[PDB]
Amino acid sequence: SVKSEYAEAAAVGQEAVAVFNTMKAAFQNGDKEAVAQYLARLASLYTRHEELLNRILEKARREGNKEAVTLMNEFTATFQTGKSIFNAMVAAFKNGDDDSFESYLQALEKVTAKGETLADQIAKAL
Numbered sequence: 211s212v213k214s215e216y217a218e219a220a221a222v223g224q225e226a227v228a229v230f231n232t233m234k235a236a237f238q239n240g241d242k243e244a245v246a247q248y249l250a251r252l253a254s255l256y257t258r259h260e261e262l263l264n265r266i267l268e269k270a271r272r273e274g275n276k277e278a279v280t281l282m283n284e285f286t287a288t289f290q291t292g293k294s295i296f297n298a299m300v301a302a303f304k305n306g307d308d309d310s311f312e313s314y315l316q317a318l319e320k321v322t323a324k325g326e327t328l329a330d331q332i333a334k335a336l
């Protein structure tokens with residue numbers, strides 16, 4: 211169903227949030243090897259989430275669930291804002307620009323919060 215597909219995508223998103231927190235702690239602790247590994251993990255999780263979201267979006271659209279589609283489109287906008295920030299943060303990491311990296315972390319926390327509430331709203335609209 212839309213609900214079961216939603217729960218699959220939710221578990222991928224929940225992993226992405228948890229991995230981000232572990233990555234951030236590694237950065238603060240100076241473990242750059244770990245930061246690099248977790249950035250690569252996040253890149254793959256974001257790709258997977260995008261793939262899952264698009265399939266759910268089209269099913270909800272065919273089902274005439276206009277509210278869920280509207281909320282999914284809002285979530286995509288926040289998620290893609292975060293993805294673009296993430297890509298710039300990966301560049302800052304490999305360039306050793308730690309002040310840029312810190313600024314991006316702050317921006318990603320704000321985007322993540324917007325996506326967390328939208329994710330809750332999507333579940334209610336199903």
Ligand SMILES: COc1ccc(-n2nc(C(N)=O)c3c2C(=O)N(c2ccc(N4CCCCC4=O)cc2)CC3)cc1
Binds near residue numbers: 222266267318
């Ligand atoms: C079909 O559409 C969705 C959308 C979202 C969910 N979904 N459900 C839950 C939940 N029910 O717990 C969660 C999510 C999710 O995706 N979450 C998330 C992942 C990633 C970001 N980030 C990280 C940094 C880059 C930007 C960005 O947006 C933000 C939020 C929060 C947890 C299911 C289905």
